[model samples]
Target: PTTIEREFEELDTQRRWQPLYLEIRNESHDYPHRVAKFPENRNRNRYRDVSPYDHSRVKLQNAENDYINASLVDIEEAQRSYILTQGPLPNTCCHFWLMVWQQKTKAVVMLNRIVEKESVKCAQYWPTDDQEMLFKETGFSVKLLSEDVKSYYTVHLLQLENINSGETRTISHFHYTTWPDFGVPESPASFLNFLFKVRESGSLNPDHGPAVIHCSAGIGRSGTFSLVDTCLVLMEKDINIKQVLLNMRKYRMGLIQTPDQLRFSYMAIIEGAKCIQKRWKELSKED
Candidate 1:
């Protein structure tokens, strides 16, 4: 009977069970993002950066300088496989990066097939079994609507699909925070605590891989998180933070993003490198 039931079990399990790596996709310099050419709209966003755009250069080097507030070694650790996001994000300070994926297409189809005693119209072919199960169990949005799941390259914490060269260009952006905002109203202590958890979570990796992190422009928040994370790393590796910062200022263009962000980090470090405690996220929040 157990042997006969194995087939049913397989169907119920849905996803091929295996450990999945936590991916934090950020962009780098090599596969730079191309900005859309402005069509001379007199009535655009009032506060948009009117910075000159040169069509000749498709690369956005702003991530570095914009991120000039953080440490570099940390950024490197946070961005394991960096790729360019949609535009020139001011804080990301990495140079060129090799994309692990390029020029490949992906697709899948799903059909829903069930309804419970308590509810509903029918099954959802849109959400895959994995997503459906997640929805059922936690009532959360684990994955995207699976109707047309297009695969793309996640660079610099963004996803891009480039249909022209078949190389990835279209990208979806995301962030992680102790709270929902991902550090909008920066809580120095809370953020410090988050930095520690990121450091501690390294152990959760079987091979002890570092965490992947990013925020808008992939610099300010990303930089600060990376900075705090790196301080913890250097604490064990015996590297000087000032040296790292200097090198960031010189070779990387800029690592930290702003003065205010830098001050938060400075205070945290000056407080004697304490590891703050933060509870693990609910399983539903993985997305």
Candidate 2:
């Protein structure tokens, strides 16, 4: 194993070796951002660890109530972007769909389960097959058109409609169901495959609005997906992975919660780069 600064141990492993987890756990919480402890947001936030910065929080438009624990993160250089948000609460479910319609989001990448360990991490914001769920608070409705379920992930085709405007839009819901609440996935293969599936759908295209991504608190698992995907994109052009993560923190604090998650990001990036490079060579040889 390789070591970086002597203080931070290298996590590069052939197998699933959780390295620097202890160090990462402590350092990840040492941020200076203001707590989402504001009186107004106390009831709005699902978890304390999940908070949107005042400067970067995504605001709802032209509504009496316009607050959701969401932030818009733009990595223009990589042509990658996201609106990192917390899972919607019962009271905020309307706001969740409202923001999606207003922002013109093409897909929603959900990383946490609706219920976990007897706790409801997020509301069932989407409808069941051919079933409809209405968020009367924001005057919007959602209908699930189709679903494709796999062992580790599920994808849904949904129709989002604005009740007042009578405007309708389609949204792709990519839900990865295997990630544990406080831990990383079993391996990066399943996670990366799910990611490429989203990419192939053109949901991550910069021409469209940023994809809405959320986990339990909108930070841990969400950050892991965002960091890994962003790093892989940047790696194609040979960018610094660590610096990209730090830069992302400026937009949404506490991206990856554990050292293991950070280590997993490295693993995923390395794996993705191998595939990317191999394809590059094949195309080169053909030319």
Candidate 3:
């Protein structure tokens, strides 16, 4: 048998799989999300087609400034929270950092590249060691402390400072380099490895503020990442897979973009569940 079969054996099915996805899709249409549009948000958004809902949108402290494209998603059952935002536009890079500082976020997860297929998906928000990038618009500056380069991922230690207040905090920058735009990862192994890496770092801990997560659109791949992470956490208690996704959409709109993305989420959760069980078994043996 394959790894998937073994993992499935470890889990108890509470609901039929595919039909739950249909329930999520049908529920999405009536999810009660409002379309958000503000005069200040026009040119600052990377994608005109994508915008956050006014209800769940993450607002900046600077009342005069409303340019950041981001939303806060809270999942109570799994004890997971995330700030799902679109890729920062060139002009909104400062607002991005401001949101990080204002929200008290400990980490920022990027799911898209700076450039893809000769198109720019997001602005380079962090600075290099050579020079700290200054967000003059928001009176903030970012400096790169260090970076760990792996085959499919990169983690950066960054110093985020408020230029005016002269306050600073260390932020973890977790970038997944291998996921293609509008597509899932090549396999569940690499994806699960990446997920655990972030969780083990304690960035996802509820003690800290919600981690800000983004992709080109934020809803597509960002939703996929949050969905899988939440499901795996809840799977420890037995999962109601589809119900979790539906509940998450209440906080943010259009999560799990395509049917294919939904399928991959299930596969990721199964594999990640195996990892969790393996660790438990090892500890039990020692006891």
Best by TM-score: 3
TM-score of 1: 0.37
Comparing 1 and 2 on lDDT, the stronger one: 2
- Give per-residue lDDT, candidate 1, residue 153: 14
Q: What TM-scores do the predictions have?
A: 0.37, 0.85, 0.86
Segments in model 2 whose C-alpha atoms lie over 4 Å from true places? 1-36, 276-287
Candidate 1, residue 239: the lDDT equals: 45
Write the number of the candidate with greater lDDT, choosing between 1 and 3: 3
Question: Which tens-of-lDDT digit does each residue in 130-207 have in candidate 2?
Answer: 768999988999998888887777899999999889889989999988898878976766777778888889988867
Which 10 consecutive residues of model 3 have the lowest summed lDDT?
A: 278-287
1-39: candidate 1 lDDT, tens digit per residue: 232134324533663222110111112122211232244
Rank candidates, TM-score, best first. Answer: 3, 2, 1
| Least well predicted 10-residue stretch by lDDT in candidate 1 | 103-112
lDDT of 3: 0.79
- The candidate that wins on lDDT is 3
Tens-digit lDDT string for candidate 3 (49-139): 6767677788888558754678889877677889999888888888888999999999999988899889999988897566979888889
lDDT (0 to 1) per candidate: 0.30, 0.79, 0.79
Those runs of model 1 whose alpha carbons end farther than 4 Å from true positions after fitting are: 1-185, 203-211, 237-242, 249-252, 276-287
Clashes of 3: 0
